[PDB]
Amino acid sequence: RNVALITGITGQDGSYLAEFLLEKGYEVHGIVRRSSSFNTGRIEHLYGNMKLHYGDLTDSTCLVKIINEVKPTEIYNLGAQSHVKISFDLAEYTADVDGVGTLRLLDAVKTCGLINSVKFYQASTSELYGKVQEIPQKETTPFYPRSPYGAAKLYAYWIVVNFREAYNLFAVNGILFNHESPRRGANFVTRKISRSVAKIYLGQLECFSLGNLDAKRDWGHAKDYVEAMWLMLQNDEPEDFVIATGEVHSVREFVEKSFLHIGKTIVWEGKNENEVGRCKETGKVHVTVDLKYYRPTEVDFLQGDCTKAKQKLNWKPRVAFDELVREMVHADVELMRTNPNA
Amino acid sequence: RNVALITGITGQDGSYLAEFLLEKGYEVHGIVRRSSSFNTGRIEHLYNMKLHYGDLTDSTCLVKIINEVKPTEIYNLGAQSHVKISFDLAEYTADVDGVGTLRLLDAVKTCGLINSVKFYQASTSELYGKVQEIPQKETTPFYPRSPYGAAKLYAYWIVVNFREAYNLFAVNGILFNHESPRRGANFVTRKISRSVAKIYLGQLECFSLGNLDAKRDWGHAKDYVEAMWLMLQNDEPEDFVIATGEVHSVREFVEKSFLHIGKTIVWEGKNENEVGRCKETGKVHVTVDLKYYRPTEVDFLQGDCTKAKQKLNWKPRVAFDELVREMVHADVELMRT
Amino acid sequence: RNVALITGITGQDGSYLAEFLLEKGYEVHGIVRRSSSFNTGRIEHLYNMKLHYGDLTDSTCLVKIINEVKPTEIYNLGAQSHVKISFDLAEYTADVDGVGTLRLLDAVKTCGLINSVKFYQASTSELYGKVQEIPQKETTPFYPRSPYGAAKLYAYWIVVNFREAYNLFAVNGILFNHESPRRGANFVTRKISRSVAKIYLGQLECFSLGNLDAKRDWGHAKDYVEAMWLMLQNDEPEDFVIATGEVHSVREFVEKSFLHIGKTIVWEGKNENEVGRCKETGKVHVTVDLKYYRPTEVDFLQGDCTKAKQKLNWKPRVAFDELVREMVHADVELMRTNPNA
Amino acid sequence: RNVALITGITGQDGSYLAEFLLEKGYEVHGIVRRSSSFNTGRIEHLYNMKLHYGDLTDSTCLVKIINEVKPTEIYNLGAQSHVKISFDLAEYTADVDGVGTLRLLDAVKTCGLINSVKFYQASTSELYGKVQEIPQKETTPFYPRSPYGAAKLYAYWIVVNFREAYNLFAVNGILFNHESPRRGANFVTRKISRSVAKIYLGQLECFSLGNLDAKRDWGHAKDYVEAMWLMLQNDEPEDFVIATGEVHSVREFVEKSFLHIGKTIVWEGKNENEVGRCKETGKVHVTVDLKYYRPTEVDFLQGDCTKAKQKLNWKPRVAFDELVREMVHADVELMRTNPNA
Ligand SMILES: NC(=O)c1ccc[n+]([C@@H]2O[C@H](COP(=O)([O-])OP(=O)(O)OC[C@H]3O[C@@H](n4cnc5c(N)ncnc54)[C@H](OP(=O)(O)O)[C@@H]3O)[C@@H](O)[C@H]2O)c1
Ligand SMILES: NC(=O)c1ccc[n+]([C@@H]2O[C@H](COP(=O)([O-])OP(=O)(O)OC[C@H]3O[C@@H](n4cnc5c(N)ncnc54)[C@H](OP(=O)(O)O)[C@@H]3O)[C@@H](O)[C@H]2O)c1
Ligand SMILES: NC(=O)c1ccc[n+]([C@@H]2O[C@H](COP(=O)([O-])OP(=O)(O)OC[C@H]3O[C@@H](n4cnc5c(N)ncnc54)[C@H](OP(=O)(O)O)[C@@H]3O)[C@@H](O)[C@H]2O)c1
Ligand SMILES: NC(=O)c1ccc[n+]([C@@H]2O[C@H](COP(=O)([O-])OP(=O)(O)OC[C@H]3O[C@@H](n4cnc5c(N)ncnc54)[C@H](OP(=O)(O)O)[C@@H]3O)[C@@H](O)[C@H]2O)c1
Ligand SMILES: C[C@H]1O[C@H](OP(=O)(O)OP(=O)(O)OC[C@H]2O[C@@H](n3cnc4c(=O)[nH]c(N)nc43)[C@H](O)[C@@H]2O)[C@@H](O)[C@@H](O)C1=O
C-alpha cells in the first residue's frame, strides 16, 4: 500500500512529484487552498488515483481531518509562501505558513496516531545557508538565513528534527538548491527571464527590468529534484540531504544565454541601477535594472555539495544549466505564440 | 482626490468594482494574495490600477499598504466566501472573514486615517440564515447558519463598533446573492451554467447537485458593486440591504438553464434519488448527491431593499431570466474555446 | 461517570464551579495558562481535581487535553473577560473569546465526542449592549458595544451552529453580571469594595471611578455556577438568561459600600468633575477619571430569567444588598490581615 | 532621554531589569498580560514605572504602546519560557517566542523608530541544545532540542535580519541559565530550593524530580540583567554569550541545597527508581518521576563569555555556592512567614 499526501500539490514541485508518484502506482492525495479562481493549472491534466482536499497549513483541524481520512504512508510538505522578496513584506504570514505550518502538520500526524507509520518529507532549502559560511555548502555547513522566508524555513527544519528525535518519526529535511522548469512561477527570476525573452522574440514586448544581475545560483531542474524527495523516503534511516548541481551561474548569465536562444547577443553598459542590456546587432535596450527588485539582505552566492546524496541515494542531477535555459525559453516561445496573454 | 483600496480585488465583485471605479477616474489599489500560479485572471485586462501583495491574516502588511496608498475609500471584499467549504475550514474562515475585518479597521486607525477614510464592509444575506422575517430588511434579526455566517456576523459588528466608538465612516453592505459570468465555479449558479454548457457541447453527460429546493434572491454582481460605491457617497454612514426582492429555487435555475440550450428537464423521484431527465431524449442530466448538502441549510432568502431605493436611488437592472441567459451563453462560448 | 473539563478554572466562576462539581463527586479537570508566577490562588485550597497546561489559542493542546480527560461535561469559561481592556486588546480578545470557542468545539469533534459530551458556553449580557428591549430575554436582539461583545457574539453563534449542524449538546448561558469576594480587582464592584475597605482601615483616602451612572443587574457568582450545571442536566440543549432582574447604578454600589463602613457619601459636581464626599467629615473619598470610561458604553442592563425559572427551577438566592455587604466585609478582613493584598 | 520598554516585565528578569534601570534614572515602561488575578508580585514594590496591557500575539497593541512610549531602548523578555511545557504548548510557544519577536520588531519599524531605538532580544543557551562544541561561544553552531529552542532560534535570526536589512541596533543576548529567589517555581533550581525549605520547616517530607544528571551553567539573574543593558550601551550592535563557564549537575544543586538545612543526601538506586535519602535519619526526601523528563534532553551546557568580558567589562559576580545558599535561605524565610507562599 503506497499512499502519498502532498501539501503544495498545485505548485511547481508538487505537480512534478504527483506525476512521479502516480507513475509508480501510488494513490496520491493533495491539499489545495480554496481560491476564488481555478488554481490547479499545473495538475488538471491528471484530473482515479489522484484526490484533492481543501485545506490550509494555518488550520490545524483541517489537517487532522485530511490525514485521518487519507492514512498516508508518505507525506511531502511542499506547501509554502515560497517567494523570498515577498517574504520581506509578508513576514508574519510567511512565518505562520512555512514555519508554524510545518509544526501543525507534524502535530496532526502525531494526533492521528501515525507517528510510527508515516514517512515525512520537509521541503528545506539552500536559503537556510543565506550568507554562506562555507563554499560549497553541505549538510554540516552552519545556517545563516537572510530573509523572513529563510528564518521561517529554519524553524521548520529544526521542528522536523525535533519530531524525529523526540518521537522517532521518520522525518527528513531535503535541503534543495534552486530548481526550475517550464512550470516555475512567473515571479522567480528564471521564469521571469524566459517569459520576457520569449515575448521579445515574438514582438510582444520590447524591454523588461530585473534587480541584482550579479547574484549567483546553483540551478537544477525540478523534475530531477522531486525524484530525490522520494529517494529520501525510501532510505532505511531518516537522514537530511543537500540536493544540488554544484555548478554556479549568475543572473546575468541566465539573461545572456536566454537571449542567445532567440538569436540575440546582449551587451551590458552602465553600473548598478543604471545598468542596461542592449542588443549588439540593433542597439535596442532589452534589459534594465530597478531597485524595487533588490532584496534588503541579498543571498549573494550558493553552490551545493550533494556528495552525501550521490553516495547514499544514488541520486544525480541529469539536466545541466545550458539545457535548462534552452528548455525554458523554447517552452515559453511556444506558450506565448499560442496565446499572447499566457 | 479619489483613491480606493480594494481587498479581494481578484474575486468576482472586486473585478467589477475595480472597473467601475476606474471608469470614474479613481486611482485603484488592490490587495492580492501571493499565489504559486497566476491568480489575476478577472482583472489582468486592466493592467491607474496598482496591486500589492498582502493577506487579511497579516496585520503588518495591511498597515504598510494603507500607509503607502493613503486611500480615501476602502472596500473590504476579501474573504473565504464559500459557505460549504466554511464547515471544514471554519477556523481559517473566522480568521480571514471575521478577525481580518478587525485587522483592516485597526490598520486604518494605526495609520491615522480614522477621520479621513470611508470603509465598506462586505456583509451578506447569510447573516439572516434561518430567516426571522420575510422579506428581510436592515432591522431583521440575524440568525447565521454556518461558520461563514458567524464570521461575517463578527465582522458586521466590529465595523459597527469602529463607527460608534471612533466615528469612522464605515458601512455594512448587506448584499444578497449576486452572480455573473465571472462567478466562482463552485457556487451553484456557475456550477449549473458551466455544467449545462458542457452538456450542450457533448463534454459532459450528467452532473450532481445538492438541495434543489433552496430558494434565493439572485442579482447581477455588476449592478451590486455600484451600490457599494453609492453607500460611500451617502452623507451619513448607514447599513443597507441590496437585493432584487424576487425569489427562485435552485431547481428553477436548472430548468431555465437547460431551456437555453434547447432542453426541457423533467423531474422524477424524491430526495437524494431525484433525477432530472431530458424530455426529448430521456437521458439523465441531473442527479442529487448528499455530499453537496450543508449540515445547516439556509432554506430561503428574499431581500427588501426599500431603504437603498429611497436613500441611494439604487435599483437592480438585470433580472433573473437575463442573468441565467447571460451565464449559460457565456459558458457555452467559454467551453467551446 | 461524571468528568468535567473547565476552561478558565483559575477565574472567578471556574473556582466556584470547580467547588460545586467536586461536592457532587465529579472528577474535575481544568485548563490553566502557563504563567511566570503563581496563578492558581482561587483554587489552590482544592489541590479529584487535576490541572493541565493549555491555551484557547493552541488547537493541538486542546485535543491532547480532551483526549486524556474524556470529559462528560465541558464548561468553556476561559476568556479575556475585561470589557475596557478589550478596546486595546481587540485581536487577542477575538482570538481567545471568539475563535477559541471554535477551537474547543472543533477539538470535541476531532476527539469523537460530538454525541457524548455536553458543552456549556459562557455567554454574557454584553451581547445585548445597546439594549433593544427592557428587560432583556433570550429573544432580545443582540447589539454588542465592544470588541469583547463582538467576540462573544461570534462564540454564541458558533456554539448554536455546532448544536444545529452536528447535534452537539451545547448551550449558551447568557449570564448577567455576577460578583463575589473572588471577583477580579479591575471590575467595578471589587474595585469599590477593596477601595472602601482600605479607606475604612486608613490605608487609602480616595479612589477614582469612571461612569457612575452605568446601571447593572448584579448577582452572586456562586448562585450562577449552579445554573450552568443545571443547563447541562436539562433534557434538551437550550440557551438561558441568568440574572436577578433588579437594576442598580455604580453610584448606588458606591453609596451602599460606604454605608457598610459607617459613611454617607454625598455627591457634588458633574461628569469628570463629580466627587463623592463624606457627609460627616467632608473628606473627598471618590473622584471621576475619564480614563476609566469606555468609548462605547453599555448604559443599562436588566435580565429577564423567566425561561430559566420555568425550565430549570433556578432562582437567584443572593440579592444586591447582601452582595455588597459580603464583598465589603470580605475585603475589610482581607486588607486587615494583609495591607498589600 | 532614557526611556526603556520591557516586554516580560512581570517575569524574573524583567523585575530585576526594571529595578536596575530605575536606579539609573530611566523612565521604565512594561507590557503586562491581562490576568484574572494579580500577576505583578515581582514588581508591585516599584508602583518612574508605567505598565501597559498587551500581548506579544496582538500586533496592534504593540504599535499603540510603542507609539505612546517612544522608547530609546526595548528589551524583549516576554516569552513562554518553560522548556518542558513547550512540548505540549508548541504552537503557542512558537507564536509568542518566535513570531512575537517579529511582531515587536515590525511594530518598531511601523512606529518610525528603526533608526532611533536599541533592541535587546532574550536569546538563550537552549539554542545550542545538543552542544556542538564545549564550551559554547557565539560561533558555536545551534542545535535546538525543543519547541522552545526552535521558536527562540527563529527569533534570534529574525532579529539578525532586522539588524542587517534595516540597520536596526538589535542584539541577541545568548544567556545561559540564570536563577534567583524570584525564579519561577517550576524551574529546577527554585523547585529544589522551595522544596528543601519546606522540608526544613516540616511542611513537606519528600519531592520528585526528573533528570538528576543534567548539567547546567547557572548564574544569578541580577548579574545577567546588567549584561543586557551593557549590550545596548555598546557602540556597535553585537551578539554575546553571557554565562559563568562553571558546570554543575541537578544532583549537585540538590546536595548543596540540603547541606544548607543540615542534611547530607545519599543516593541509592538507578533511573526512575533512584532516591535521595538523609544520611543521619534514613528518611527519603527526593524521588524521580519520568513525567519530569523531556523527550529530547539538553544534557550539558557550559558558556564561554570571553567576548563579553573583553568588550562589555561584564563578569559574573555571584558563583554557584552563593546562588544556592541565597535561594534556600530566601525560601526558608518566605515559607516561615507564610506556609502557603
Ligand atoms: N523551487 C525551488 O527552487 C525550491 C528549493 C528549495 C525549497 N523550496 C521550497 O520547496 C517547496 C516547493 O517549491 P515550489 O517551487 O513548488 O513552490 P510554489 O510553486 O510556490 O508552490 C507552493 C505551494 O504551496 C502552497 N501553499 C502556499 N500557502 C499555503 C498554505 N497557507 N496552505 C497550504 N498550502 C499553501 C501553494 O498553493 P497555491 O498554488 O494555492 O499558491 C503551492 O501549492 C516550497 O516549500 C518552497 O519553499 C523550493
Ligand atoms: N457574491 C455574493 O453573492 C456575495 C454576497 C454578499 C457578500 N459576499 C461577500 O462579498 C465579498 C465578495 O464576494 P465575491 O463573490 O467576489 O467572492 P470571491 O469571488 O470568492 O472573492 C474573494 C476574494 O477575497 C480574496 N481573499 C480570500 N482570502 C483572502 C485572504 N486571506 N487575504 C486577502 N484576500 C483574500 C480572494 O483571493 P483569491 O482570488 O486569492 O482567492 C478573492 O479576491 C466576499 O467578502 C463575500 O463573502 C458575496
Ligand atoms: N463574571 C461575570 O459577570 C460574567 C458574566 C457573563 C459571562 N462572563 C464570562 O464568563 C466567563 C467567566 O467569567 P469570570 O468572571 O470567571 O472571568 P475571569 O475571572 O476573568 O476568568 C477568566 C479565565 O479565563 C482564563 N483565560 C484567559 N485567557 C485565556 C486563554 N487564552 N486560554 C485559556 N484560558 C484563558 C483566565 O486565566 P488567567 O487566570 O490565567 O488569566 C481565567 O481562568 C468568562 O468567559 C467571562 O467572559 C462573565
Ligand atoms: N532565566 C533564564 O535562565 C533565561 C536564559 C536565557 C533566556 N531566557 C529567556 O529570557 C526571558 C526572560 O526569562 P525569565 O526567567 O524572566 O522568564 P519568565 O519569568 O518566565 O518571564 C516571562 C515573562 O514573559 C511574559 N509573557 C509570557 N507570554 C507572553 C505574551 N504572550 N505576551 C506578553 N508577555 C508574555 C510573562 O508574563 P506572565 O507573568 O503574565 O506569565 C513574563 O513577564 C525569556 O524570554 C526567556 O525565555 C531566560
Ligand atoms: C531554493 C530557493 O530558490 C528560490 O529562492 P531565490 O533564490 O530567491 O529565487 P529567485 O529566482 O526569486 O531569485 C534568485 C536570484 O535572482 C535575483 N534576482 C534578480 N532580479 C530578480 C527579479 O527581477 N526577480 C527575482 N525574483 N529575483 C531576481 C534575486 O535577488 C536572487 O539573488 C525560491 O524557490 C525559494 O523558495 C527557495 O527555497
Ligand SMILES: C[C@H]1O[C@H](OP(=O)(O)OP(=O)(O)OC[C@H]2O[C@@H](n3cnc4c(=O)[nH]c(N)nc43)[C@H](O)[C@@H]2O)[C@@H](O)[C@@H](O)C1=O
Ligand atoms: C450572499 C451569499 O451568497 C453565496 O452564498 P450561498 O447562498 O451559499 O451560495 P451557493 O451558490 O453556494 O448556494 C446557494 C444555494 O444552492 C444550494 N445548492 C444546491 N446544490 C448545490 C451545489 O452543488 N453547490 C452549491 N455551491 N450550492 C448548491 C446551496 O445549498 C444553497 O442553498 C456566497 O457568495 C456567499 O459568500 C454569500 O455571502
Ligand SMILES: C[C@H]1O[C@H](OP(=O)(O)OP(=O)(O)OC[C@H]2O[C@@H](n3cnc4c(=O)[nH]c(N)nc43)[C@H](O)[C@@H]2O)[C@@H](O)[C@@H](O)C1=O
Ligand atoms: C456580564 C459582564 O460583566 C462584566 O462586564 P462589565 O459590565 O463591563 O463590568 P465592569 O464591572 O467592568 O463594568 C460595569 C460598569 O461600571 C462602569 N465603571 C465605572 N467606573 C469603573 C471603573 O473604574 N472600572 C470598571 N471596571 N468599570 C467602571 C463601567 O463603565 C460599566 O458600565 C465582565 O465580567 C464581562 O466579562 C461580562 O461578561
Ligand SMILES: C[C@H]1O[C@H](OP(=O)(O)OP(=O)(O)OC[C@H]2O[C@@H](n3cnc4c(=O)[nH]c(N)nc43)[C@H](O)[C@@H]2O)[C@@H](O)[C@@H](O)C1=O
Ligand atoms: C537558559 C534556559 O534556562 C531554562 O531552561 P532549562 O535549562 O530547561 O531549565 P529548567 O530549570 O527547567 O531545567 C534545567 C534542567 O533540570 C532538569 N530537571 C530535572 N528535574 C526537573 C524538574 O523536576 N523540573 C524541571 N523544571 N527541570 C528538571 C531538566 O530536565 C533540565 O535538564 C529556562 O529559563 C529557559 O527559558 C532558558 O532559556
